[PDB]
Amino acid sequence: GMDLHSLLELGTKPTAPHVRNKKVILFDTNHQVSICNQIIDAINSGIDLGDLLEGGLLTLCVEHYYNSDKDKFNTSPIAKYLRDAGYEFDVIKNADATRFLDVIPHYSPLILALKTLGRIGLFLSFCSLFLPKLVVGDRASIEKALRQVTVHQEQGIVTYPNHWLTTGHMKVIFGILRSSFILKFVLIHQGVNLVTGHDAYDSIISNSVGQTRFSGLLIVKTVLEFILQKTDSGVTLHPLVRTSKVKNEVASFKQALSNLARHGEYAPFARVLNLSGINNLEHGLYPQLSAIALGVATAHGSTLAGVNVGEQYQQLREAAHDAEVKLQRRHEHQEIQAIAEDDEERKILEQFHLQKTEITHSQTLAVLSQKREKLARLAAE
Amino acid sequence: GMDLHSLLELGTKPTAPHVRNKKVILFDTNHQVSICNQIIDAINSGIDLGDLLEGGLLTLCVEHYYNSDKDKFNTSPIAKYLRDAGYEFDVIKNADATRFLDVIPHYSPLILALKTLGRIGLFLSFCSLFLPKLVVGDRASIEKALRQVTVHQEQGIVTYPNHWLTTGHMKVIFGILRSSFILKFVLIHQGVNLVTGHDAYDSIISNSVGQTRFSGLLIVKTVLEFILQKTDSGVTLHPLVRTSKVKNEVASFKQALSNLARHGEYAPFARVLNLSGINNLEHGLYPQLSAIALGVATAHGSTLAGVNVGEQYQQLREAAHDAEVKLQRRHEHQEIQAIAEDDEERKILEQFHLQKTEITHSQTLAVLSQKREKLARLAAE
RNA sequence: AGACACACAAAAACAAGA
């Protein structure tokens, strides 16, 4: 009895092959800070380096995190992991280069644009500010960038240049970050693998990386924290999802999650970096499961009601919301009657539970009205 | 049955890697006290050393704690722990340097600023005064700095220069301390690892470090001292938090706490020094748990009612406050009826308990009114 | 022959006392 359903899955197990071969060029320049400042000046003017973009951003990376040290960079875990991923790093000794145009190897638009010609930490932290809401688009991305700038200035950590706060500048930074994989990956690796010794700039990087965890993968968090639960008897299934309708869907989700598992420590950033198997965690491929999980999560988490969802999911999400609210009131009643001893703690615990549920209800309605207002202003635009 | 929920956690276990490579330069100068006084004069004038900042503050550190001894400094536990963290220490022999500008290796603003040109213990103790309230911002930071200066003058320990008490000077010191990791870490290490032999200055350092314990980590103290308790049967769960709503949240908090455990003796200063896993102890990631723990703590500790919290937490915190007050009156009634022997001690113990609860109620209301008044003046600003 | 659908969507520093 050969397994037929494996033909539904064999397309998602590449057995770890090697395809990538990118010629990323490294620069050894005595005027390291000078060329880095030139790169920053080029970027703030909205200049697209294209092919040179990877090299320039890697130069900024090595300057800020290794102080122009190449021996340690090429043996760093970033370098080894990109060895696995298929990135080639080679060093070019342009020691006497002073102008930015000297180091660059279809160049005509770039050359014509360049005719117009710890700040590195400022630039890298500003780029990292885009990570938490990078995949949601550009509107919310720049909104959260502005919020992060305001909160960081309020904490007194960093005071950014005023000109960087212009809408065009964040648009350029969003474009350059979305189009470049190396900037993302180095930022996430530095945020994740740093243990101690953070300055202000590395602290901002680490905070942005932590906020970027599971960005664009809300389905993963919702399903794992609101449907599949580990008890003392192993993993259990949510009572609301025992139907085959979503049972097969959960089986498919488990398959996709196991496929995503092989990526490793960077699995939470799979949507940010577009890793393999990320398209198998799509909302479209799990419509009912996504709607049910999001409804249950909204029932638990008040702030989760602010998520905007497609119009084909709203009714199911609201139904799951109401159902899960009822089952949770049921479960709190069961726990109160089961675990306690006498009537006094029954009454005080149930009064507290009623107050907490009322507070969550009010907060959920407020955030739902806020989401309605946001959709209204977006439609009016 | 592979563990799926490990994909929710693999991003927070770096397996102790090495990323940092900072070129911290050490200075061997015969005019050690002279260059240190020059550094102090530069700082009091609000001069930002930037790159030279780490070297200058390390020079002050080695002067005050080792009397310009480099052999013991480079083998000190600070040096070894920074070996692990990825700091490189190299010595430069600028023996004949007299002007501050001689020892410094984008320098133009710094050079132009420098054209305008046991006090070391005074400077270091003044900096350490900022540690207890460093992460709360600048307002409360300078307020507690002023309070500490007043109390230390009253004890007769130290009499600071009057010009250092100007608002601009504490602002500069707050900026220099917040932007520099090395100053923090050396201050905390000296405060923690000192056993005896404190002079006045090291005594101030140790007192500030002790007051800095768990700064910005009030959630940790509240959860560990008001929710999870060790009985003779191991750790127990608070009756108010047996709901799954916060049960999963406590599981996540336990995960984050275990992640923070690997840091070691500097775990209480994780928020101060921005260690790894500090962003996993966020209030946002544990809204209900943070509000409940803070409410319970306020019910126990009267002075804890003065904490300012976000507007989305106030109702839940007050509900937890009232509930915990009721459960504690319940528990005192149980203990009095259970552990005692006859009626006389029942009556006197219950009268004392009633008086104590009334006193705590009055103090909590007073501090709540004080917090209201503080918020009122802050809003009026 | 084939026939559909399928980016993302929220929140997220700290807060007292000593």
Side-chain angles (χ1 to χ4, degrees):
Chain A
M2 61 79 71
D3 186 74
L4 293 97
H5 285 115
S6 72
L7 294 174
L8 203 45
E9 304 176 355
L10 290 175
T12 64
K13 198 195 44 184
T15 57
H18 178 277
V19 177
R20 282 295 89 203
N21 189 359
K22 279 320 192 212
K23 300 289 94 175
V24 176
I25 62 170
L26 283 53
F27 286 163
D28 276 21
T29 304
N30 63 7
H31 294 88
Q32 173 69 287
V33 291
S34 166
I35 62 170
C36 284
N37 299 6
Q38 290 320 313
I39 294 170
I40 290 168
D41 291 331
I43 299 304
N44 74 27
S45 299
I47 301 299
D48 186 74
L49 305 191
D51 309 347
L52 184 59
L53 195 63
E54 322 297 323
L57 277 296
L58 188 153
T59 295
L60 294 174
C61 165
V62 64
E63 206 296 323
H64 187 273
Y65 322 131
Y66 284 80
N67 296 114
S68 72
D69 173 316
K70 307 310 201 323
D71 184 332
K72 283 308 303 181
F73 194 110
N74 293 356
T75 191
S76 69
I78 297 169
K80 296 183 290 294
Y81 166 81
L82 289 196
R83 296 294 86 193
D84 292 331
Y87 267 102
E88 294 294 328
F89 289 135
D90 73 314
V91 62
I92 311 300
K93 313 283 309 283
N94 290 115
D96 302 323
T98 312
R99 176 158 301 296
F100 191 8
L101 283 72
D102 304 2
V103 298
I104 187 166
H106 62 276
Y107 324 120
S108 307
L110 193 148
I111 302 313
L112 269 296
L114 283 189
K115 303 302 101 183
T116 62
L117 271 298
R119 191 173 180 178
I120 297 169
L122 281 78
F123 182 76
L124 294 174
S125 284
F126 188 75
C127 290
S128 66
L129 290 202
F130 289 74
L131 297 196
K133 283 188 155 199
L134 181 83
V135 296
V136 306
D138 80 5
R139 289 311 315 158
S141 199
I142 66 170
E143 294 294 328
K144 196 181 191 306
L146 294 168
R147 184 181 331 160
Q148 276 291 3
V149 175
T150 52
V151 67
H152 281 312
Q153 300 164 300
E154 191 277 332
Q155 307 175 240
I157 289 288
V158 292
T159 302
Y160 274 52
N162 64 87
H163 200 298
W164 283 4
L165 276 297
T166 53
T167 61
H169 183 257
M170 291 86 58
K171 187 278 160 193
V172 172
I173 302 313
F174 167 57
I176 191 167
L177 191 44
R178 188 101 181 101
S179 66
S180 167
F181 170 85
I182 198 74
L183 203 43
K184 310 184 201 302
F185 171 78
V186 299
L187 291 193
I188 296 89
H189 188 102
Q190 291 277 12
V192 165
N193 291 273
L194 263 172
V195 180
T196 79
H198 292 82
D199 54 355
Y201 293 161
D202 291 331
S203 183
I204 282 155
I205 306 292
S206 179
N207 164 78
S208 295
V209 164
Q211 290 195 350
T212 302
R213 272 188 88 79
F214 296 107
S215 180
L217 294 174
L218 179 48
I219 190 167
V220 179
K221 293 187 287 185
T222 47
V223 171
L224 294 174
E225 312 200 26
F226 301 100
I227 291 174
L228 281 83
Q229 285 68 243
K230 321 211 190 301
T231 61
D232 288 331
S233 297
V235 59
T236 189
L237 294 174
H238 195 283
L240 189 150
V241 302
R242 314 271 171 61
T243 65
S244 280
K245 297 286 187 180
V246 296
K247 184 63 52 63
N248 275 41
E249 201 165 26
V250 175
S252 176
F253 195 87
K254 272 197 212 154
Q255 161 193 354
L257 183 63
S258 179
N259 285 327
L260 202 51
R262 278 85 171 92
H263 284 315
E265 293 83 3
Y266 309 74
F269 316 88
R271 183 69 41 113
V272 179
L273 320 169
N274 296 115
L275 277 81
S276 176
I278 193 57
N279 296 265
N280 305 326
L281 277 296
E282 261 295 356
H283 286 288
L285 282 71
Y286 313 92
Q288 292 171 87
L289 183 62
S290 163
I292 281 169
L294 184 59
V296 170
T298 303
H300 280 158
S302 66
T303 175
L304 294 174
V307 295
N308 189 3
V309 189
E311 293 83 3
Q312 63 273 60
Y313 294 100
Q314 311 218 70
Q315 276 85 320
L316 183 44
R317 189 263 296 274
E318 291 180 354
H321 184 44
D322 307 345
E324 183 63 26
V325 160
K326 293 187 286 185
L327 282 72
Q328 294 298 109
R329 294 184 322 89
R330 179 66 178 86
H331 186 268
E332 317 188 323
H333 186 273
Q334 262 280 291
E335 294 293 328
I336 291 170
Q337 64 85 30
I339 71 171
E341 290 85 10
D342 64 72
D343 291 331
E344 192 36 71
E345 80 265 13
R346 304 301 191 291
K347 313 174 281 273
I348 55 185
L349 278 192
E350 301 156 10
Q351 188 274 331
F352 165 74
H353 282 83
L354 190 148
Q355 183 57 18
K356 182 174 72 68
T357 55
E358 181 285 346
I359 297 169
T360 59
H361 190 299
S362 175
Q363 271 166 359
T364 299
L365 266 63
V367 67
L368 183 63
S369 68
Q370 183 66 221
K371 181 175 73 175
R372 274 311 81 71
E373 192 285 359
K374 281 172 189 341
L375 277 178
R377 54 170 50 121
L378 266 294
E381 285 162 14
Chain B
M2 61 79 71
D3 186 74
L4 293 97
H5 285 115
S6 72
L7 294 174
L8 203 45
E9 304 176 355
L10 290 175
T12 64
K13 198 195 44 184
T15 57
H18 178 277
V19 177
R20 282 295 89 203
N21 189 359
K22 279 320 192 212
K23 300 289 94 176
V24 176
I25 62 170
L26 283 53
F27 287 163
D28 276 21
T29 304
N30 63 7
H31 294 88
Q32 173 69 287
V33 291
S34 166
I35 62 170
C36 284
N37 299 6
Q38 290 320 313
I39 294 170
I40 290 168
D41 291 331
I43 299 304
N44 74 27
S45 299
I47 301 299
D48 186 74
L49 305 191
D51 309 347
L52 184 59
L53 195 64
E54 323 297 323
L57 277 296
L58 188 153
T59 295
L60 294 174
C61 165
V62 64
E63 206 296 323
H64 187 273
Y65 322 131
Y66 284 80
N67 296 114
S68 72
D69 173 315
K70 307 311 201 323
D71 184 332
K72 283 308 303 181
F73 194 110
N74 293 356
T75 191
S76 69
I78 297 169
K80 296 183 290 294
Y81 166 81
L82 289 196
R83 296 294 86 193
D84 292 331
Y87 267 102
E88 294 293 328
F89 289 135
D90 73 314
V91 62
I92 312 300
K93 313 283 309 283
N94 290 115
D96 302 323
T98 312
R99 176 158 301 296
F100 191 8
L101 283 72
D102 304 2
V103 298
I104 187 166
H106 62 276
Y107 324 120
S108 307
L110 193 148
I111 302 313
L112 270 295
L114 283 189
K115 303 302 101 183
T116 62
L117 271 298
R119 191 173 180 178
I120 297 169
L122 281 78
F123 182 76
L124 294 174
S125 284
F126 188 75
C127 290
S128 66
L129 290 202
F130 289 74
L131 297 196
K133 283 188 155 199
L134 181 83
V135 296
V136 306
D138 80 5
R139 289 311 315 158
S141 199
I142 66 170
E143 294 294 328
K144 196 181 191 306
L146 294 168
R147 184 181 331 160
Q148 276 291 3
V149 175
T150 52
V151 67
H152 281 312
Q153 300 164 300
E154 191 277 332
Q155 307 175 240
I157 289 288
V158 292
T159 302
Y160 274 52
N162 64 87
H163 200 298
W164 283 4
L165 276 297
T166 53
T167 61
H169 183 257
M170 291 86 58
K171 187 278 160 193
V172 172
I173 302 313
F174 167 57
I176 190 167
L177 191 44
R178 188 101 181 101
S179 66
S180 167
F181 170 85
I182 198 74
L183 203 43
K184 310 184 201 302
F185 171 78
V186 299
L187 291 193
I188 296 89
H189 188 102
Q190 291 277 12
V192 165
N193 291 273
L194 263 172
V195 180
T196 79
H198 292 82
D199 54 355
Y201 293 161
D202 291 331
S203 183
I204 282 155
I205 306 292
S206 179
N207 164 78
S208 295
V209 164
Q211 290 195 350
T212 302
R213 272 188 88 79
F214 296 107
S215 180
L217 294 174
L218 179 48
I219 190 167
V220 179
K221 293 186 287 185
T222 47
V223 171
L224 294 174
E225 312 200 26
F226 301 100
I227 291 174
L228 281 83
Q229 285 68 243
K230 321 212 190 301
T231 62
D232 288 331
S233 297
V235 59
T236 189
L237 294 174
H238 195 283
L240 189 150
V241 302
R242 314 271 171 61
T243 65
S244 280
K245 297 286 187 180
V246 296
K247 184 63 52 63
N248 275 41
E249 201 165 26
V250 175
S252 176
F253 195 87
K254 272 197 212 154
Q255 161 193 354
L257 183 63
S258 179
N259 285 328
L260 202 51
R262 278 85 171 92
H263 284 315
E265 293 82 3
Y266 309 74
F269 316 88
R271 183 69 41 113
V272 179
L273 320 169
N274 296 115
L275 277 81
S276 176
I278 193 57
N279 296 265
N280 305 326
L281 277 296
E282 261 295 356
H283 286 288
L285 282 71
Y286 313 92
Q288 292 171 87
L289 183 62
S290 163
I292 281 169
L294 184 59
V296 170
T298 303
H300 280 158
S302 66
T303 175
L304 294 174
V307 295
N308 189 3
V309 189
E311 293 83 3
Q312 63 273 60
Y313 294 100
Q314 311 218 70
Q315 276 85 320
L316 183 44
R317 189 263 296 274
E318 291 180 354
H321 184 44
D322 307 345
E324 183 63 26
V325 160
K326 293 187 286 185
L327 282 72
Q328 294 298 109
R329 294 184 322 89
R330 179 66 178 87
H331 186 268
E332 317 188 323
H333 186 273
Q334 262 280 291
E335 294 293 328
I336 291 170
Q337 64 85 30
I339 71 171
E341 290 85 10
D342 64 72
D343 291 331
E344 192 36 71
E345 80 265 13
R346 304 301 191 291
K347 313 174 281 273
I348 55 185
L349 278 192
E350 301 156 10
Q351 188 274 331
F352 165 73
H353 282 83
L354 190 148
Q355 183 57 18
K356 182 174 72 68
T357 55
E358 181 285 346
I359 297 169
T360 59
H361 190 299
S362 175
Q363 271 166 359
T364 299
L365 266 63
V367 67
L368 183 63
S369 68
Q370 183 66 221
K371 181 175 73 175
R372 274 311 81 71
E373 192 285 359
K374 281 172 189 341
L375 277 178
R377 54 170 50 121
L378 266 294
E381 285 162 14

